[model samples]
Target: FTGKFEMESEKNYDEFMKLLGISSDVIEKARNFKIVTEVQQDGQDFTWSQHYHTMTNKFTVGKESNIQTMGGKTFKATVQMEGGKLVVNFPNYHQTSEIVGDKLVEVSTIGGVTYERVSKRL
Candidate 1:
């Protein structure tokens, strides 16, 4: 269940970020950002790392850790697998990802708006 992947496509991401109170300039940069992810798992312990355009982050599942956002702020979150989906409970929102038809289907919800980003194996 551990592998490397890259973003294939994103849907409603602009509206999603806008719902999160992101600015237009930052959203423009984010729209062009390429993202790659590496997943390493040993039993219930998992380490997932994401290489973004300007930053990288690694976190362990089921553990509380500090996560740096593109907005230059850090917050604590607990990542865990629940109901067969990787769920991250952020300070103000929740993000979930799961494997669906060979693609990683990611869902992010904040302020009642939900966005989806789908990534394929690289």
Candidate 2:
């Protein structure tokens, strides 16, 4: 959970961009993006970053933190990192990330549309 990971594959993601009202032109670009994620974990504190349009978030496990949604809305949310899994909630969706067999598996679900991305440790 405290390492760098690079995008390997993604699924059911195009619908996600549409929910954010992003244009198809950039949606195509996003489809081909190779996101790199890095997690710096020290005890109960964690800083997680992804180069997928540059989102760097830091928070303590089980504590409240400032959160910005994909649609650029801001709010307060409690981030939980329990049993090597990070759980987060956004206004538009719910997200969870965990390490599975040395790979990072991230899942984002907005109702029936579920977006999943699997990343490899770097």
Candidate 3:
């Protein structure tokens, strides 16, 4: 995974946000949000970058790092690639991402609610 990927479609995100107790106003804004991600892989080390509306994040794989969520919560986490998927373990959520048929498929689960976002290589 060494390319830029832009959001193409998403599913169950609104419900997922609802489960997280996000405000309706924020949820509405999130429904129309666009996210871009860049991934670089060099052997077993990797860097993942994400660009959102007003924030950007860059983190290395398998290394401890800090991250800020869309809800404005900061926490420490570790991202790793396992079983051919990129797995991120946050304090309140877990995400798994992988490339499938020219698309980047990311799944995020929080409090048993699952959200899916698919991005296309750009």
Highest-TM-score candidate: 2
Q: Model 2: per-residue lDDT, tens digit, 43-116? A: 98888888866787778878898865544566788887667778988677788989999899999898789989
Clashes of each: 0, 0, 0
Looking at model 2, the pairs that clash are: none
| lDDT per residue as tens, model 3, 76-97 | 8888879889788766789898
lDDT of 1: 0.78
- Candidates in order have lDDT scores of 0.78, 0.84, 0.81
* TM-score, every prediction: 0.80, 0.86, 0.80
- List runs of model 1 lying over 4 Å from the truth: 52-56
Which digits, one per residue and each the tens of the lDDT, describe model 1 over residues 5-60? 78988888888978777899989987887787777778766666678745445666
The local lDDT score (0 to 100) that residue 3 gets in candidate 1 is: 77
Predicted candidate 2, C-alpha RMSD: 2.1
Model 2: residue 106 alpha-carbon error in angstroms: 0.6
lDDT of 1 at 90: 66
